[PDB]
Design a protein around this ligand. Structure first.
Ligand SMILES: COc1cc2nc(C)nc(N[C@H](C)c3ccccc3)c2cc1OC
Length: 472
């Protein structure tokens, strides 16, 4: 047809081949069509489509492309997309040109205005979005940035120079940011037995339970806000380049692991029954203050430690926990039942700030990664399943909704360092450390036929909690 013949030939340009069932497919539409799957060449063509802007596809593609295309490869493909060949002059214009006259160039001017200029501006819009929302690709790869800067720095014409200046302004702002707010005063920092600065005495029962929950919420809020969506795409936190591709996500997971295991260690290593009741009761009070602060991540870290194999079996310890605290713990656990039905209602109704439970996002993303194929086959050809990536991107979009909710709480540097440097395992691996905790659990409360032994006290300081009500 006429529309296809005016486009460049396949022997001079790869992004102009006709659409077909074996190179691009779409979801049901009733409006910009939604791409279900396509080859990388068709995804690049639609990423920089001449007929209309597509901000949803650009956003989803730049968040998830690392699962099917390398950053260097994507830059080469969008640069290749930008370099469009122009049609040859018509016979009449060829005669005008050889006589030294100005050609009419009717179709040539139309191709430049309706195809070349829109595609080139779309390529530049992709570059701008890439540097604005995913500058980490350029921080990790200095050669990728040198290539980008050379490309934008050699684009000609005043119409595109304004776009180039906007891209450069972002790149420079990002480089400057690598180098170098409250309405009310935050509440008073709470202290119990440990005095400010006496970091040697810092522990679960010597620090104030209110301040443990506040500082852990500040720590977890910062860790939550730092996770970038691409760190969660294609299960990259479970593959070889995990440390480079998912640094903030792995830091969130390791804090959750270390805090949960630290709570369990505090419990099972407290061999005296009465002292262990005080330890468990103090962790429940920490959960209460996490609930007050809408730190659902912290509430469910306490629930995980209490449900763990070594702690959950301590019938004699929970027997002495007051009914009110046991009820608080049971309702916190019921937040997780029925696929987190009650947690989702609580999260939707609460007033910010909050720290959402991060584990549910990992669970849902892994379900989507394992449950959907990487590619779709149509007529014996493989197409990248883009709808799978879009489903993951929508879960990461929910994460981003709660990443702009700072707390009006004062940081206590020593308490912050104490929780950032938790190392319950020491030199042990996780599996061997959990086997240790379970054997310690069997020692302090042996299985039913065997009687319950007495153990000596380990804490010199008083065990009475100062409560969860502030002081002033
Ligand atoms: C069927 O399994 C369970 C059901 C559970 N129901 C409730 C209501 N609370 C659980 N734990 C919470 C944190 C708890 C409360 C009081 C004392 C100790 C622990 C459960 C744990 C389970 O397994 C580990």
């Amino acid at each position: 047809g006429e529309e296809q013949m005016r486009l460049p030939s396949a022997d001079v340009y790869r992004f102009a081949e006709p659409d077909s069932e074996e190179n691009i497919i779409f979801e049901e539409n009733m409006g910009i069509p939604i791409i279900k799957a396509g080859t990388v060449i068709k995804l690049i063509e639609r990423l920089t489509y001449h007929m209309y802007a597509d901000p949803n596809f650009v956003r989803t593609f730049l968040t998830t492309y690392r699962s099917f295309c390398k950053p260097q490869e994507l830059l080469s493909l969008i640069i290749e997309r930008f370099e469009i060949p122009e049609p040859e002059p018509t016979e009449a214009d060829r005669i005008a040109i050889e006589n030294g006259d100005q050609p009419l160039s009717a179709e040539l001017k139309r191709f430049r205005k309706e195809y070349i200029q829109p595609v080139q501006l779309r390529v530049l819009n992709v570059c701008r979005h890439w540097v604005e929302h995913h500058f980490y690709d350029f921080e990790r790869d200095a050669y990728l940035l040198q290539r980008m800067e050379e490309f934008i720095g050699t684009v000609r014409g005043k119409a595109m120079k304004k776009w180039v200046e906007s891209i450069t302004k972002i790149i420079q702002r990002k480089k400057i940011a690598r180098d170098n707010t409250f309405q009310s005063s935050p509440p008073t920092v709470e202290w119990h037995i440990s005095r400010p600065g006496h970091i040697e005495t810092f522990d679960l029962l010597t620090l104030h339970p209110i301040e443990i929950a506040r500082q852990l919420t500040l720590l977890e809020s910062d860790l939550y806000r730092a996770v970038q969506p691409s760190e969660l795409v294609g299960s990259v936190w479970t593959k070889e380049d995990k440390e480079i591709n998912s640094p903030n996500l792995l830091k969130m997971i390791r804090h959750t692991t270390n805090l949960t295991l630290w709570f369990e260690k505090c419990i099972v290593e407290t061999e005296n029954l009465e002292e262990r009741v005080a330890v468990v009761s103090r962790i429940i009070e920490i959960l209460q203050v996490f609930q007050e602060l809408n730190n659902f991540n912290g509430v469910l870290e306490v629930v995980s430690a209490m449900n763990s194999s070594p702690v959950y079996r301590l019938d004699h310890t929970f027997e002495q926990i007051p009914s009110r605290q046991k009820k608080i713990l049971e309702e916190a656990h019921e937040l997780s039942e029925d696929h987190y039905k009650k947690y989702l209602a609580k999260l939707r109704s609460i007033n910010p700030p909050c720290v959402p439970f991060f584990g549910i996002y990992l669970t849902n993303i892994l379900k989507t990664e394992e449950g959907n194929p990487e590619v779709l086959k149509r007529h014996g050809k493989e197409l990248i399943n883009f709808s799978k990536r879009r489903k993951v991107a929508e879960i990461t979009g929910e994460i981003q909704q709660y990443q702009n909710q700072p707390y009006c709480l004062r940081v206590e540097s020593d308490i912050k360092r104490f929780f950032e440097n938790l190392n319950p395992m020491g030199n042990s691996m996780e599996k061997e450390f959990t086997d240790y905790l379970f054997n310690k659990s069997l020692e302090i409360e042996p299985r039913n036929p065997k009687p319950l032994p007495r153990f000596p006290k380990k804490y010199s300081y008083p065990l009475k909690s100062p409560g969860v009500r502030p002081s002033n």
